[PDB]
């Protein structure tokens, strides 16, 4: 098992990238105030191999200016989990 590297980027579109993980099974989602967003209000990457024996994926959602502090990206992989804010 290889734990994902999780990185959140703000462009407002916020994107949560999980990279370099194994096995391919992973849960990633945006939350607003801890409440998991529906699948249909997020944009989803495929889970793709990276040529080093691991996988990567991503999930994005569109938010309004000033709402960043309400949004977090939740990850579960291989019995572990984490929560990441939008960087400021």
């Amino acid at each position, epitope marked *: 098992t290889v734990p994902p590297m999780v990185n959140v980027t703000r462009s407002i579109t916020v994107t949560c990238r999980a990279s370099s993980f194994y096995p391919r099974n992973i849960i990633l989602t945006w*939350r*607003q*105030d*801890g*409440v*998991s*967003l*529906s699948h249909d*209000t997020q944009q989803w990457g495929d889970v793709l191999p990276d040529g080093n024996g691991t996988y990567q994926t991503w999930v994005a959602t569109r938010i309004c200016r000033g709402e960043e*502090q*309400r949004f*977090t990206c*939740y990850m*579960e992989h291989s019995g572990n*989990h*984490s*929560t990441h*804010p939008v960087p400021s």
Partner: antibody
Framework: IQLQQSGPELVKPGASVKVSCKAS????????IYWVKQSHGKSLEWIGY????????MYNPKFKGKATLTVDKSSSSAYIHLNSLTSEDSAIYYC??????????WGQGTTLTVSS | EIILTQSPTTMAASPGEKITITCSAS???????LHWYQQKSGFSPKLLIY???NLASGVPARFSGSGSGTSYSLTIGTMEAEDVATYYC?????????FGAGTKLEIKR
């Protein structure tokens, strides 16, 4: 999933109180804990929530400087500290946990009476 | 804050009656951030409907919800004795999070 709160409390006006909420049935740091006030015969009022993984609270401005939210991993518990207590603070206080909604699961409530 | 106005304040339904209660928001919200709770007397509230129309775990199929914008509703397709409770709508679109004042449903017999 179970949220078990501490028992009823009588506290003197002007003093403080800390109410606990022990969360079981899921990984403690994987979901936000919320707090709600219900005065007798009245509606539900959101106090605040805390994201336990990074320990980041958010407060209703109605309760800024009244309520302080904390967590503790060894007890699998969230806490609400209420200061400068008055009769208006007498109410049932509920812990809750978000998920698909802001309040997927609720504790049993804690009755706080502020009186001398 | 977003004010949620629930109507009726109270209502008695006959057994087997289809009953609809309404939640009106002071401004437009996404249906994904509107939820309903049921509080039976002597108990804590429980999640009933999430994101406007999705039944929570343990909730029987006679419940449903609809709405968008500023206008939301909850329907019980056939009123049963165990459905006597206060029903609250709640929005999570904007901070502070707010609840309606509740609709108290009782049953005729």
């Amino acid at each position: 999933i179970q949220l078990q709160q501490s028992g009823p409390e009588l506290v003197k006006p002007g003093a403080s109180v800390k109410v606990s909420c022990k969360a079981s049935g899921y990984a403690f740091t994987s979901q936000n804990i919320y707090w709600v006030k219900q005065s007798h015969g009245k509606s539900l009022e959101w106090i605040g929530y805390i994201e336990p993984y990074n320990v980041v609270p958010m407060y209703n401005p109605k309760f800024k400087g009244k309520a302080t939210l904390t967590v503790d991993k060894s007890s699998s518990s969230a806490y609400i500290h209420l200061n400068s207590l008055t009769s208006e603070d007498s109410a049932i206080y509920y812990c809750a946990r978000s998920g698909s909604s802001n309040f997927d699961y609720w504790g049993q409530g804690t009755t706080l009476t502020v009186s001398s | 804050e977003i004010i949620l106005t629930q109507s009726p304040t109270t209502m008695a339904a006959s057994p087997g009656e289809k009953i609809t209660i309404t939640c009106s928001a002071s401004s437009s919200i996404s249906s994904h951030y509107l939820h309903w709770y049921q509080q039976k007397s002597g108990f804590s509230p429980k999640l009933l409907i999430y994101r406007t129309s999705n039944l929570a775990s343990g909730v029987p199929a006679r419940f449903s919800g609809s709405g968008s914008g500023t206008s939301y509703s909850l329907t019980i397709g056939t009123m049963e004795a165990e459905d006597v409770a206060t029903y609250y709508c709640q929005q999570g679109s904007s901070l502070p999070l707010t609840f309606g004042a509740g609709t108290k449903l009782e049953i005729k017999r």
